Amino acid sequence: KSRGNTYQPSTLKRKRTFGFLARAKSKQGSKILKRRKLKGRWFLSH
Amino acid sequence: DGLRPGDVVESFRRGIPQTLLNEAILSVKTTQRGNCLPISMIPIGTIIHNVGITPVGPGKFCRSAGTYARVLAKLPEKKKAIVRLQSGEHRYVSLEAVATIGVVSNIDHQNRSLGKAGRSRWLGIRPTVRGVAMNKCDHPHGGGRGKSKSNKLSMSPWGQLAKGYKTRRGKNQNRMKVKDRPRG
RNA sequence: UAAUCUUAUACUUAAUUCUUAAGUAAUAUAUAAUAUAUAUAUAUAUUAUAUAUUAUAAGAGA
RNA sequence: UGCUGACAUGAGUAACGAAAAAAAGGUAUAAACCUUUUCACCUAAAACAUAAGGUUUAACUAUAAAAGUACGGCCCCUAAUUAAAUUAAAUAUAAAUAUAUUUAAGAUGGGAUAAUCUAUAUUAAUAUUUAUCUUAAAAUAUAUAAUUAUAUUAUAUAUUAUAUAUUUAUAUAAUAUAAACUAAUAAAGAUCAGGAAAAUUAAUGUAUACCGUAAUGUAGACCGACUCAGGUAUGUAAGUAGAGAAUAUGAAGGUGAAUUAGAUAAUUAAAGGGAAGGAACUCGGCAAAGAUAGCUCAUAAGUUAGUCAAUAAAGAGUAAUAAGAACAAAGUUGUACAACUGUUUACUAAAAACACCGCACUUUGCAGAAACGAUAAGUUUAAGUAUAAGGUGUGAACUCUGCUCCAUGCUUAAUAUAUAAAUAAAAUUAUUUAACGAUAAUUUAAUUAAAUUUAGGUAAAUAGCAGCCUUAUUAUGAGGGUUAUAAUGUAGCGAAAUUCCUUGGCCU
RNA sequence: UAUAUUAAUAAUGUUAUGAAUAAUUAUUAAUAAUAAUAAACUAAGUGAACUGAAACAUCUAAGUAACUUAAGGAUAAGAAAUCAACAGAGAUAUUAUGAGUAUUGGUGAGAGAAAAUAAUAAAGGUCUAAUAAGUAUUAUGUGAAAAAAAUGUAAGAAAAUAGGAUAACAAAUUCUAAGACUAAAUACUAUUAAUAAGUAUAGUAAGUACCGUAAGGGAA
Ligand SMILES: [Mg+2]
Ligand SMILES: [Mg+2]
Ligand SMILES: [Mg+2]
Ligand SMILES: [Mg+2]
Ligand SMILES: [Mg+2]
Ligand SMILES: [Mg+2]
Ligand SMILES: [Mg+2]
Ligand SMILES: [Mg+2]
Ligand SMILES: [Mg+2]
Ligand SMILES: [Mg+2]
Ligand SMILES: [Mg+2]
Ligand SMILES: [Mg+2]
Ligand SMILES: [Mg+2]
Ligand SMILES: [Mg+2]
Ligand SMILES: [Mg+2]
Ligand SMILES: [Mg+2]
Ligand SMILES: [Mg+2]
Ligand SMILES: [Mg+2]
Ligand SMILES: [Mg+2]
Ligand SMILES: [Mg+2]
Ligand SMILES: [Mg+2]
Ligand SMILES: [Mg+2]
Ligand SMILES: [Mg+2]
Ligand SMILES: [Mg+2]
Ligand SMILES: [Mg+2]
Ligand SMILES: [Mg+2]
Ligand SMILES: [Mg+2]
Ligand SMILES: [Mg+2]
Ligand SMILES: [Mg+2]
Ligand SMILES: [Mg+2]
Ligand SMILES: [Mg+2]
Ligand SMILES: [Mg+2]
Ligand SMILES: [Mg+2]
Ligand SMILES: [Mg+2]
Ligand SMILES: [Mg+2]
Ligand SMILES: [Mg+2]
Ligand SMILES: [Mg+2]
Ligand SMILES: [Mg+2]
Ligand SMILES: [Mg+2]
Ligand SMILES: [Mg+2]
Ligand SMILES: [Mg+2]
Ligand SMILES: [Mg+2]
Ligand SMILES: [Mg+2]
Ligand SMILES: [Mg+2]
Ligand SMILES: [Mg+2]
Ligand SMILES: [Mg+2]
Ligand SMILES: [Mg+2]
Ligand SMILES: [Mg+2]
Ligand SMILES: [Mg+2]
Ligand SMILES: [Mg+2]
Ligand SMILES: [Mg+2]
Ligand SMILES: [Mg+2]
Ligand SMILES: [Mg+2]
Ligand code: NA
């Protein structure tokens, strides 16, 4: 069993979990977004 | 138990209807197996199943294969009826509570032997890992070199004693039980 | 046991719907009077006065 | 073993990543690019269609063309599940929030019509899993209506000839390969008992929206830091052969590569052969070698009766006698451990460990026991009800499972028995006050728990199962007498995976 | 579906008997809608641990970090049921002295006021309450290291002839709880000006490249 390939992309899943709207919808995600904005981040979410 | 397709069963939970009233004398007609009625109608001594608590609620006790209760006494003063359940616990049940006549079907269910692990899995039963097999962090019986019981009293993974320890105790006990079930 | 707890399930006035108030009709309970039937008591019918429109049923219960 | 930068050293060393290349020409510029021919490799793929993914890598900017029918999304519908949403007072909660209910979302699934092409809008009105046998039917041949042997047996279409509506329709008859495969049909075996959710006529409509479409996809175009021998879903996968998607070949298609040319010492790897011997090797037959049909027969002891053992070993038939493709097929036995098929340390342990089916104990009567819940409401348990569910040990079955409650627990009963907080009113004492009083302590009086203790019970609860003496001529010790205890190791097994002394004694 | 209805008209074509029913266009009137909003400062809730004590358990770190909630340009506090001591002062806030003093501590580690006098400060006093009860007080459990005011559970007053304040009591003194408002000095952010024995690795790029599934990290 060879490791290394732990990332296994699937756009839909990514957008569900780490997408902007998911962040927006949760309180915790909204807080994250705010924190990133404060930092100065160009890209707040996937 | 002896029910087979073609048999006829009534239910006298509402009461004795005007068909049978127009046409004890009624008790023997009524107390055929398979038909339901309040414990008031059911004569003392006879075997029953799907025994209720309350006069309105459904039959709760004695539902499993080959199981049954038995009417022991009835008290119209207090509106109760002492019933022996399958466990052996004598218990007050509302005198107007529901109960079917006869023993439950499939008496020989208990005698089945599952052949293999897979059958249990199909039924929906994942494997039980023994406390002695575990590590100490996981279960009190765990740890030790070789196989050991750690001088630890037989108990659950959360420290509740497994052999003999009465779990329903003190104030929170059953109010309606007349005589407790036979133990050991 | 109206301590606690558990379970189940019409019209008319005044500020299209909404709410108040009055009286009336309908149902239920309590109290008083009259008539009838049974063994001072119980049941039924009629009249007057008062109250109501979270409930009812089941269970546990100081 | 400071941090950052720059540059050395090893060193022009190893390596250049499974590989088959050759010539001619594009080009008097080519080992590496393009073409042609030859040769090879993959071929139930290294092919052809696709899914997901991605720096568009593509046959490219003059760029991947859809009203719908062996076209997908979008849309309708819902599953798993999700939701600062939903209900003077839904419930709970230090806040955050959590729960229940509604509603909404949510594909991996379901969704009308269609080449004789098809019309989706609006308005109105009342389907787990597997199987297709046997029988029976008729057909074809042998023998003398009936027997024997052999295939065929529900559906799928063109042709010809009839009979009815009128060359277009409906029905009937006859003609017509084998082996796979599909869909749709029917009947039906087994227990493990098999999703959810969204009407029909009539009239009036319908100018048909958006997005996906390249190429790559067992890979140089994704996930692995690399153009990485790893990981990566689905469908076709020429024939010949075969039981087959095994194995050989390879029609077609694709490919022959960011390393080449030579040389082939020692040495290493991965292969091929080997005289005489045949485990003498070694910790150990590790490794290697070993297959005298794969079809049809036949196949023992033992045994839990299961061709379990068995794919038995040997052996036969067919084939072959000097041999002459690949692939499947690699002995027999004794003992230890574990019933068995399974599971396990992803990346050093696959086991004797876990699990298991069975066995036993125990808890809980359901407004239960168990678990979860800053901690609740509540949830699972369960749409179950003691033949159930939770916990514990043991681990199929045969023969069996002895004695012991001392201790730690659990469990039952005793006002046997102490102590905690909680109370009236009233007695001295102390402080203060000129006095009563005020403020402190202390002591009295009825009504006291669970706990503890005592006595049972409970060991398939946690646990335990002693030593000395010396008696039948010597020996052995059936016996005999003691001490100690809760009881004093029973059946069995025994130098055991348990035996230190130990390479115990004896046999094979 | 607001280049929407719904109605009222006007123009057009069709149906059935001048009037009625539907469709299309054009005016007039009527009907709802758009959260991207700071961060720091403040107040409230919950509240660690490392650490110190040369161990560690009371204690400490600390009501700190953190998370959560809510407000305003500031917030908080504020016109004595305050301090003091027989003399007196007169809201609050910040600083200096008082003072590392009183006080307190497994009397260890260590913690530590107030009165008073100075500044800074603004006009700093002024009713808005028919004067405050399950309140004061008591018991008990907790509660800013000293100094309380708070608080869960339950008992529970008094009218200025009274009530609060100190172990307690007696004298005295002082204040009036259970109703309220309040600039100003202060905090933080931004801007402008001035001063730099500050910065060119604290001198403008970039929260980019790149790393990570993600929170997040982060160059030259
Ligand atoms: Mg990685
Ligand atoms: Mg997920
Ligand atoms: Mg187990
Ligand atoms: Mg273990
Ligand atoms: Mg533990
Ligand atoms: Mg052992
Ligand atoms: Mg240095
Ligand atoms: Mg060298
Ligand atoms: Mg060299
Ligand atoms: Mg080399
Ligand atoms: Mg050339
Ligand atoms: Mg093959
Ligand atoms: Mg392809
Ligand atoms: Mg939906
Ligand atoms: Mg789908
Ligand atoms: Mg494509
Ligand atoms: Mg294509
Ligand atoms: Mg990549
Ligand atoms: Mg790698
Ligand atoms: Mg590769
Ligand atoms: Mg082939
Ligand atoms: Mg070829
Ligand atoms: Mg290719
Ligand atoms: Mg290469
Ligand atoms: Mg040889
Ligand atoms: Mg030889
Ligand atoms: Mg040797
Ligand atoms: Mg070998
Ligand atoms: Mg035999
Ligand atoms: Mg083989
Ligand atoms: Mg095994
Ligand atoms: Mg391993
Ligand atoms: Mg291994
Ligand atoms: Mg294991
Ligand atoms: Mg089992
Ligand atoms: Mg519980
Ligand atoms: Mg059980
Ligand atoms: Mg075991
Ligand atoms: Mg057994
Ligand atoms: Mg035993
Ligand atoms: Mg006491
Ligand atoms: Mg031993
Ligand atoms: Mg705070
Ligand atoms: Mg320390
Ligand atoms: Mg230490
Ligand atoms: Mg502190
Ligand atoms: Mg203010
Ligand atoms: Mg006042
Ligand atoms: Mg006052
Ligand atoms: Mg107090
Ligand atoms: Mg401090
Ligand atoms: Mg006041
Ligand atoms: Mg104020
Ligand atoms: Na153990």
- For B75-128, give the DSSP string: ETTTTEEEEE-TTS-EEEEETT-EEEESPPS-GGGGG----SHHHHHHHT-PPP
CA distance B91 to B71: 10
CA distance B184 to B179: 15
Solved with? cryo-EM
Residue type, B48: I
Nearest to B27 by CA among B11, B14, B48, B43: B43
CA–centroid distance, A5 to ligand 25, in Å, is: 51
Residue type, B7: D
Discontinuities in chain A (C→N > 2.5 Å), after residue: none
Strand E contact with A3 (CB < 7 A): no
Q: Are B161 and B152 in contact (CB under 8 A)?
A: no
Could you say which nucleotides of strand E lie within 7 A of any protein CB atom? Answer: 39, 68-69, 206-209, 212-218
CA distance B81 to B96: 8
Q: Are B53 and B85 in contact (CB under 8 A)?
A: no
Residues 85-104 of B with CB under 7 A from strand D: 85-87, 89, 91
CA–centroid distance, B28 to ligand 8, in Å, is: 110
Resolution, given in Å to one decimal, reads 3.2
Strand D contact with B56 (CB < 7 A): no
The kind and range of the H/E element at B47 are: strand B47-49
CA distance B181 to B76: 25
The kind and range of the H/E element at B73 are: strand B69-75
CA distance A35 to B85: 64
Q: Kindly report the CA angle at B107 between B101 and B113, in degrees rounded to 5?
A: 160
Strand D contact with A9 (CB < 7 A): yes
CA–centroid distance, B92 to ligand 37, in Å, is: 26
- Which backbone phi and psi does B72 adopt, to 5 degrees? -105, -45
Q: Are B158 and B167 in contact (CB under 8 A)?
A: no
Q: Are B1 and B105 in contact (CB under 8 A)?
A: yes
